[PDB]
Structure formats: structure tokens, C-alpha cells
Design an enzyme around this catalytic site. Structure first.
Site, PDB file in Angstrom:
ATOM      1  CG  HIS A   1      -0.048  -5.100  -2.633  1.00 57.63           C
ATOM      2  ND1 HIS A   1      -1.072  -5.406  -3.503  1.00 57.63           N
ATOM      3  CD2 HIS A   1      -0.088  -6.041  -1.659  1.00 57.63           C
ATOM      4  CE1 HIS A   1      -1.707  -6.483  -3.074  1.00 57.63           C
ATOM      5  NE2 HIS A   1      -1.128  -6.888  -1.957  1.00 57.63           N
ATOM      6  CD  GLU A   2       2.955  -6.178   1.570  1.00 57.47           C
ATOM      7  OE1 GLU A   2       2.362  -6.401   2.648  1.00 57.47           O
ATOM      8  OE2 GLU A   2       2.908  -6.976   0.603  1.00 57.47           O
TER       9      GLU A   2
HETATM   10  N1  LIG Z   1       1.152 -12.532  -3.595  1.00 58.79           N
HETATM   11  C1  LIG Z   1       2.132 -12.047  -2.837  1.00 58.79           C
HETATM   12  C2  LIG Z   1       2.716 -10.790  -2.700  1.00 58.79           C
HETATM   13  N2  LIG Z   1       2.570  -9.626  -3.331  1.00 58.79           N
HETATM   14  C3  LIG Z   1       2.959  -8.500  -2.468  1.00 58.79           C
HETATM   15  C4  LIG Z   1       3.238  -7.283  -3.353  1.00 58.79           C
HETATM   16  C5  LIG Z   1       2.115  -7.113  -4.376  1.00 58.79           C
HETATM   17  C6  LIG Z   1       2.062  -5.940  -5.120  1.00 58.79           C
HETATM   18  C7  LIG Z   1       1.077  -5.755  -6.085  1.00 58.79           C
HETATM   19  C8  LIG Z   1       0.137  -6.755  -6.304  1.00 58.79           C
HETATM   20  C9  LIG Z   1      -0.964  -6.587  -7.355  1.00 58.79           C
HETATM   21  N3  LIG Z   1      -0.789  -5.348  -8.128  1.00 58.79           N
HETATM   22  C10 LIG Z   1       0.097  -5.237  -9.114  1.00 58.79           C
HETATM   23  O1  LIG Z   1       0.873  -6.128  -9.456  1.00 58.79           O
HETATM   24  C11 LIG Z   1       0.107  -3.871  -9.802  1.00 58.79           C
HETATM   25  N4  LIG Z   1      -0.774  -2.937  -9.419  1.00 58.79           N
HETATM   26  C12 LIG Z   1      -0.794  -1.721  -9.982  1.00 58.79           C
HETATM   27  S1  LIG Z   1      -1.786  -0.361  -9.678  1.00 58.79           S
HETATM   28  C13 LIG Z   1      -1.079   0.684 -10.835  1.00 58.79           C
HETATM   29  C14 LIG Z   1      -0.058  -0.043 -11.452  1.00 58.79           C
HETATM   30  C15 LIG Z   1       0.092  -1.354 -10.992  1.00 58.79           C
HETATM   31  C16 LIG Z   1       1.010  -2.313 -11.407  1.00 58.79           C
HETATM   32  O2  LIG Z   1       1.819  -2.059 -12.298  1.00 58.79           O
HETATM   33  N5  LIG Z   1       1.026  -3.582 -10.815  1.00 58.79           N
HETATM   34  C17 LIG Z   1       0.930   0.511 -12.485  1.00 58.79           C
HETATM   35  C18 LIG Z   1       0.410   1.716 -13.272  1.00 58.79           C
HETATM   36  S2  LIG Z   1      -0.230   2.983 -12.122  1.00 58.79           S
HETATM   37  O3  LIG Z   1      -0.845   4.125 -12.877  1.00 58.79           O
HETATM   38  O4  LIG Z   1       0.856   3.477 -11.211  1.00 58.79           O
HETATM   39  C19 LIG Z   1      -1.507   2.123 -11.137  1.00 58.79           C
HETATM   40  C20 LIG Z   1       0.187  -7.927  -5.559  1.00 58.79           C
HETATM   41  C21 LIG Z   1       1.172  -8.112  -4.595  1.00 58.79           C
HETATM   42  C22 LIG Z   1       1.195  -9.427  -3.812  1.00 58.79           C
HETATM   43  C23 LIG Z   1       3.650 -11.275  -1.591  1.00 58.79           C
HETATM   44  O5  LIG Z   1       4.547 -10.780  -0.909  1.00 58.79           O
HETATM   45  C24 LIG Z   1       3.032 -12.615  -1.787  1.00 58.79           C
HETATM   46  O6  LIG Z   1       3.184 -13.765  -1.251  1.00 58.79           O
HETATM   47 ZN   LIG Z   2      -1.694  -8.409  -0.397  1.00 58.02          ZN
END
Ligand SMILES: Nc1c(N2CCc3ccc(CNC(=O)c4nc5sc6c(c5c(=O)[nH]4)CCS(=O)(=O)C6)cc3C2)c(=O)c1=O
Ligand SMILES: [Zn+2]
Ligand SMILES: [Ca+2]
Ligand SMILES: [Ca+2]
Ligand SMILES: [Zn+2]
Length: 163
Positions: free
Chosen positions: A118-119
Site C-alpha cells: 500500500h505504502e
Molecule cells: N489508514 C491508515 C493506514 N493504512 C496504511 C496501510 C494500508 C494498507 C492497505 C489499505 C487498504 N487495503 C487493504 O486493506 C487490502 N488490500 C488488498 S489488495 C489485495 C488484497 C488486499 C487486502 O487483503 N487488504 C488481498 C488479496 S490479493 O489477491 O493479494 C489483492 C489501507 C492502508 C491504510 C495508516 O498507516 C493509516 O493511518
Molecule cells: Zn494510504
């Protein structure tokens, strides 16, 4: 889904360096998390990420606690997990992770690989997405899957900037 001002890297070959580690994981586990995170974006763009162990890289990676020199302090367990700066020289593109967080390689809070992936989106010039299934969605939530790859919204976002 582009960071305001449309700041992007003028080169596709970028270097990164892991400056320090977290005692909650083995060095090998941290390295693998970072590597896979970058691979997510690389397989969907022309970007190439090269690791270096010394010298100045384009994307510095480090674990810091509270005030750490960039006027954006961390705050202990939970809350702000990490942050990264938009494409640019100097601190541009660098990503910092809060050292007071529990970093894991499982579904438990907080998965390093996921937070890092994400970062790096921000490190490449992407803004938050309103699609609840996108990696760049504003809110963190781990989802176990059979195959881990970049969601289509994030693909469109990276392609819209670097093709
Ligand atoms: N809000 C804040 C923060 N985070 C940073 C890290 C972070 C990481 C991720 C997100 C939103 N996305 C998920 O939670 C997420 N995305 C994905 S894409 C994907 C996946 C995911 C997922 O599980 N979660 C899993 C299955 S895959 O086939 O590998 C494709 C949001 C945030 C916001 C801070 O720090 C803060 O304050
Ligand atoms: Zn962000
Ligand atoms: Ca925190
Ligand atoms: Ca930098
Ligand atoms: Zn910082």
C-alpha cells in the site's frame, strides 16, 4: 487515483534499500515481505525495483518510533501504521513504518507485506481509491486469498501513470 500535482518518477528503473529491521520478524521474513510487495506493482507496469545494501537508493525503507526527523511523528500501537512521500528526490518516495506496531506475516494485525504494498503505491504517485477492494483503498483489512495479486483498480491506476 493520482496524487495531486501528478508527481511521477522520470525513470522506470528504481532502487530501494531496507535501512533497519523489526525484531518481531526475521531479517529474511522482512526482506521477503518487501520483495513481494514491490513485485505486485512491477508485474503490472514497466517499473523495475533493485535492492541495494549500501549507498543512496530512490526508495528508503525503515522502521521508526514517534518523532523521527521528518515532522510527521508516529504514535505508538495502532493508529498511523506507516506513511510514504510522493515521487521526488531526497526524502521523496521513502517509506517509513511505525516500529511500535506488531508486524506479522499472517492475517493478524499487522501484515507487513500488505502495509508495504500500500505504502509503495504512494511512493509511486498514486492517491487513495474509493473502491473497497483496491489495495489503495483508505482502510486496512486483511483478506486471505488463494492467490495474491494487484486488484484491477490499482492496475488501472499504475498504468494511467507509467503505462
Ligand atoms: N489508514 C491508515 C493506514 N493504512 C496504511 C496501510 C494500508 C494498507 C492497505 C489499505 C487498504 N487495503 C487493504 O486493506 C487490502 N488490500 C488488498 S489488495 C489485495 C488484497 C488486499 C487486502 O487483503 N487488504 C488481498 C488479496 S490479493 O489477491 O493479494 C489483492 C489501507 C492502508 C491504510 C495508516 O498507516 C493509516 O493511518
Ligand atoms: Zn494510504
Ligand atoms: Ca502507530
Ligand atoms: Ca528517496
Ligand atoms: Zn516518516
Amino acid at each position: 487515483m493520482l496524487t495531486p500535482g501528478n508527481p511521477k518518477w522520470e525513470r522506470t528503473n528504481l532502487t530501494y534499500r531496507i535501512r533497519n529491521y523489526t525484531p518481531q520478524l526475521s531479517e529474511a521474513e522482512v526482506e521477503r515481505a518487501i520483495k513481494d510487495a514491490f513485485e505486485l506493482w512491477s508485474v503490472a507496469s514497466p517499473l523495475i525495483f533493485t535492492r541495494i545494501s549500501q549507498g543512496e537508493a530512490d526508495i528508503n525503507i525503515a522502521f521508526y518510533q514517534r518523532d523521527h526527523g521528518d515532522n510527521s511523528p508516529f504514535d505508538g500501537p495502532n493508529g498511523i501504521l506507516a506513511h510514504a512521500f510522493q515521487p521526488g528526490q531526497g526524502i521523496g518516495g521513502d517509506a517509513h513504518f511505525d516500529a511500535e506496531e506488531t508486524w506479522t506475516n499472517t492475517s493478524a494485525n499487522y501484515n507487513l507485506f500488505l502495509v508495504a504494498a500500500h505504502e509503495f503505491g504512494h511512493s509511486l504517485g498514486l492517491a487513495h481509491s474509493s473502491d473497497p477492494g483496491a489495495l489503495m483503498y483508505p482502510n486496512y483489512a486483511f483478506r486471505e486469498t488463494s492467490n495474491y495479486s494487484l486488484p484491477q483498480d490499482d492496475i488501472d491506476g499504475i498504468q494511467a501513470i507509467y503505462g
